Write a protein that binds this ligand. Sequence first.
Ligand SMILES: CN1CCN([C@H]2CC[C@H](n3cc(-c4ccc(Oc5ccccc5)cc4)c4c(N)ncnc43)CC2)CC1
Ligand SMILES: [Cl-]
Length: 448
Amino acid sequence: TLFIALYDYEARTEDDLTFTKGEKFHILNNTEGDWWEARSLSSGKTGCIPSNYVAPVDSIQAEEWYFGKIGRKDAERQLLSPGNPQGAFLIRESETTKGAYSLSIRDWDQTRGDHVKHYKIRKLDMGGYYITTRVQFNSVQELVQHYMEVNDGLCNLLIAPCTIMKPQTLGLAKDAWEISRSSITLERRLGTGCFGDVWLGTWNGSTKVAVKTLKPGTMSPKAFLEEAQVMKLLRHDKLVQLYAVVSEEPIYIVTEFMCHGSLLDFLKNPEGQDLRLPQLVDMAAQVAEGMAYMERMNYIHRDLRAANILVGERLACKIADFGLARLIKDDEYNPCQGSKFPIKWTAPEAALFGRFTIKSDVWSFGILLTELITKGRIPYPGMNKREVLEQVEQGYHMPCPPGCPASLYEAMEQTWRLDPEERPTFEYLQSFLEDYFTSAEPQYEEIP
Ligand SMILES: CN1CCN([C@H]2CC[C@H](n3cc(-c4ccc(Oc5ccccc5)cc4)c4c(N)ncnc43)CC2)CC1
Ligand SMILES: [Cl-]
């Protein structure tokens, strides 16, 4: 019933609390999962707080080294980022054993180079958590405290908890999705598109946000609102976080700010040009993970391409601009009826017969792979959009791009099969891209 703050937080409205890491609370109202009413034990004052910033006191969720339901691959991405020394570690839930845990730790050897080792934290039915049966503990907390004090047979001491990215609230404020335009201040234009602008700005003069603004006449405000109600339900690490919307024209879509812009631009600037093939395949795997989430939700992107992937802190990739292409209205200059779609990225049955499915998104993902492996090259170079439609209808697809491995191109060709049911699932593509290089590793470290 008693909670403790994991991070600092500054109030944004007049209803929420300002608190410091280590401050404790009573929780009074949890009707909204994202924001809880709470009373501070330090000040005695009552206000709402972001629920993901607190954890039960003394619980494992309040430990700095506990990362909850993070994935193995995400744990590796986090541990192998700068600021984590050798011996940086985290504890997570097991992906392959219900009720078990995993200890992930950064290590180095001559064969695997700089890598992460994973240890299975199992639980005896009679009692006791253990990495090795020789030593047993009442709780995972005690296990960690022990392996932080002495290296009892691991690859290293548990030296420091893994560093975490800047935490973010789920929504700008309690019970807030549709906001007035006056609450947004557009400060710096980030770019201009055919459907509108993107700006960096603030909400309530306090919270840094990005705002995509749509030109009037782009889409029905009511249709936009009904689709945003569904988008609001999508929640995943590899999708860009929607904060709020403004429905009156011009429409605002307010999201978190991604400090490196689009993947397409990032791959062309010097930092992206220095990228090696493993990093490129890992970004592809991140996009495939987000799209596999959308596949589980049977939510169709319709506009999957490198310009609609955003790159943020730690080069994390997030999927943007999903769902909304369906609602884009017609004009007198484009013969495309009803739903608009990016010509060079759209599957033949979707472009010609309007059958948008997750399999047409798979085709799109193959095109995005060509974009990504070449570090920004235009698809079907030399061909205009009409020629592309005509040729992909006849079964033409792109040849192997320069510098693309044979297995990656075989995957692309699989995504470009004319029968949509013969294309792989995003689940398969995620598994393939994650294990593309780490093919011979043993899953968990054998340790007696
Ligand atoms: C030459 N370049 C100049 C920059 N151009 C682009 C300009 C906008 C950039 N950009 C775009 C976005 C962005 C913002 C909101 C948005 O709305 C939706 C999100 C999910 C689903 C539906 C809608 C979609 C995208 C962006 C960002 N959030 N944070 C930081 N940067 C951002 C990405 C690059 C691309 C061409
Ligand atoms: Cl935030």
